[PDB]
């Protein structure tokens, strides 16, 4: 249903291979209880807009050096990426809000 970060040159190499789509960058872990909770709210949505938005998971603790380049200091941490630029991001389990911005993002 995601797409699993493997390292940061496989980060750079979805977001150049997403074209024009809406990338959401997922910054979760496995010791993250609120990202347990968002996760599948993210999947289902990802799952009626397979056409427009790629769902990327940064593990973190697989990716430290990604978390130190994305700056995340909160768990979970949602990035929005269009044409390999940076558009918005916010942290926390927060549905509504990411439902609102890949809406106006998409």
């Given at each position: 249903?995601?797409?699993?970060?493997?390292?940061?040159?496989?980060?750079?190499?979805?977001?150049?291979?997403?074209?024009?789509?809406?990338?959401?960058?997922?910054?979760?872990?496995?010791?993250?209880?609120?990202?347990?909770?968002?996760?599948?709210?993210?999947?289902?949505?990802?799952?009626?807009?397979?056409?427009?938005?790629?769902?990327?998971?940064?593990?973190?603790?697989?990716?430290?050096?990604?978390?130190?380049?994305?700056?995340?200091?909160?768990?979970?941490?949602?990035?929005?990426?269009?044409?390999?630029?940076?558009?918005?991001?916010?942290?926390?389990?927060?549905?509504?809000?990411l439902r609102n911005?890949?809406?106006?993002?998409?």
């Amino acid at each position: 249903m995601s797409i699993h970060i493997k390292d940061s040159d496989d980060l750079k190499t979805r977001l150049a291979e997403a074209g024009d789509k809406l990338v959401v960058i997922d910054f979760m872990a496995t010791w993250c209880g609120p990202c347990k909770m968002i996760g599948p709210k993210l999947d289902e949505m990802a799952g009626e807009m397979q056409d427009s938005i790629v769902v990327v998971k940064v593990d973190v603790d697989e990716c430290e050096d990604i978390a130190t380049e994305y700056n995340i200091n909160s768990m979970p941490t949602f990035v929005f990426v269009k044409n390999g630029k940076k558009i918005e991001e916010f942290s926390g389990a927060n549905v509504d809000k990411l439902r609102n911005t890949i809406l106006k993002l998409k």
